[PDB]
Design a protein around this ligand. Structure first.
Ligand SMILES: COc1ccc2oc(C(=O)c3ccc(Cl)cc3)cc2c1
Length: 271
């Protein structure tokens, strides 16, 4: 729909940018208000840093994935500078939150709860025929009520035929990315399942970098030998075995996100 018909379009006037939360190569993230009373996050595009088409493609994709477990698109302003306005998550990113004093006092019981909420969001994405491609604790946001939601849908893609193949030159974070995607550019929901395994390590270690004290070439090499990430300190063995399922050699052997959800809920009502 054109801007004058789009229900997500709002006049820039409805928005007040209050607190700058981040700034990068491609623009800024703010805490702001919509119509005076409603707290929102506002992401702004720095002109010329990147295509306005590429920027807005994130919003158009969030028009197709609306669920409680996923950061919701609130609105767009499609005139320069371009704004994407989303659901505000008061506790910021999972990776930062688990390091704060509140984050530090969480029981293993609440961590497993939070892991099940994330699996539940990814079960929606899986069922809708999408992939995320960037699933990691930096991209799970936490609310004021300590509930979690999937965020940052910049790399998210609809799958018609099973695979999305990346370009020959494209680079992805070696520690969070499934081998087949790093190696062949091929992504599937089963690649996100591999990422979820890594994300489980970050939950149980309060946001520590995966594969403690290894470089990327060491990680790739260990994996090819059949090794997997060393048992993180104070990791229940049940959860460690759930991570191993996510890291099965063959994509098709890795579990569904709905299986991961149900196992995690069992782990949690048992603690
Ligand atoms: C300064 O730390 C914080 C605290 C709270 C915070 O909330 C957010 C968000 O809600 C958010 C929402 C959507 C995007 Cl695309 C990026 C960030 C970012 C953020 C950063």
């Amino acid at each position: 729909k054109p801007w004058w018909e789009d229900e997500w379009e709002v006049p820039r006037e409805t928005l007040k940018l209050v607190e700058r939360l981040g700034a990068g190569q491609f623009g800024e993230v703010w805490m702001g208000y919509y119509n005076g009373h409603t707290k929102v996050a506002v992401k702004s595009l720095k002109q010329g840093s990147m295509s306005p088409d590429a920027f807005l493609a994130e919003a158009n994709l969030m028009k197709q994935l609306q669920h409680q477990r996923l950061v919701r698109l609130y609105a767009v302003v499609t005139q320069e500078p371009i704004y994407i306005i989303t659901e505000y998550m008061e506790n910021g990113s999972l990776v930062d939150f688990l390091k704060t004093p509140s984050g530090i006092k969480l029981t293993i019981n609440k961590l497993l709860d939070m892991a099940a909420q994330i699996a539940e969001g990814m079960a929606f994405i899986e069922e809708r025929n999408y992939i995320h491609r960037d699933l990691r604790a930096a991209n799970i946001l936490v609310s004021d009520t300590l509930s979690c939601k999937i965020a940052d849908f910049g790399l998210a893609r609809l799958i018609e035929d099973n695979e999305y193949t990346a370009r020959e030159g494209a680079k992805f974070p070696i520690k969070w990315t499934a081998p087949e995607a790093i190696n062949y550019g091929t992504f599937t929901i089963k690649s996100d399942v591999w990422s979820f395994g890594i994300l489980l390590t970050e939950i149980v270690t309060h946001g520590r970098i995966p594969y403690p004290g290894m470089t990327n070439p060491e990680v790739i090499q260990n994996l090819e030998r059949g090794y997997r990430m060393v048992r993180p300190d104070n990791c229940p063995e049940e959860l460690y075995q759930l991570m191993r399922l996510c890291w099965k050699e063959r994509p098709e052997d890795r579990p569904t996100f709905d299986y991961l959800r149900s196992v995690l809920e069992d782990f949690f009502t048992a603690t």
